[PDB]
Paper text:
[name] plays a role in regulating ribosomal protein synthesis and stabilizing mRNAs and has a unique structure without an RNA binding RRM domain adjoining the [name] domain. Unlike the other [name] proteins which contain an RRM domain, the [name] [name] domain functions as a standalone RNA-binding domain with specificity for poly(A) RNA. High-resolution crystal structures of [name] [name] with six different RNAs: A5G, A4GA, A3GA2, U6, and (RP)- and (SP)-diastereomers of a phosphorothioate derivative reveal the molecular interactions that allow for plasticity in base recognition while maintaining specificity for the RNA 3´-end. Nucleotides (1) and (2) are rigidly positioned by hydrogen bonds between the terminal ribose and Asp346, the helical dipole from alpha helix α4, and base stacking with Phe348 and Tyr336.
To test the importance of the phosphate group, we prepared A6 with phosphorothioate modifications at the 3´-terminal nucleotide and determined the structures of their complexes with [name] at 1.2 Å. The low electronegativity of sulphur atom makes it a weak hydrogen bonding acceptor and its larger atomic radius displaces the ribose away from Phe367. ITC measurements showed the SP isomer binds with 17 µM affinity, confirming the binding selectivity for the RP isomer. (D) ITC shows the (SP)-phosphorothioate binds with 60-fold lower affinity. We took advantage of chiral phosphorothioate derivatives to demonstrate the helix dipole and hydrogen bonds to backbone amides are major contributors to binding affinity.
Author numbering: 323 to 410
Amino acid sequence: QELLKDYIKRQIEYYFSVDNLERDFFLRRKMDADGFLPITLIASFHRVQALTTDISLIFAALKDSKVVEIVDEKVRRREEPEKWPLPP
RNA sequence: AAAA
């Protein structure tokens, strides 16, 4: 599933890009104070769900990333994640 | 779901 994993990885990395985060108020409101978001929330986003509903594949796509980091069931931008959370 |  390497090709599909690459598309998934790059799609999710876009959500965690600075360009997207500057405008993505929904994503920032779902962040905890340390910037973490449930991976299953990301899995529900339409462009990811179109590609797969296989949660292990999504996890595998994200371990291959230099943009995001995973802790247990959550994911955040590696660089200055505390910059981004917003009040509900 | 203006790539939430």
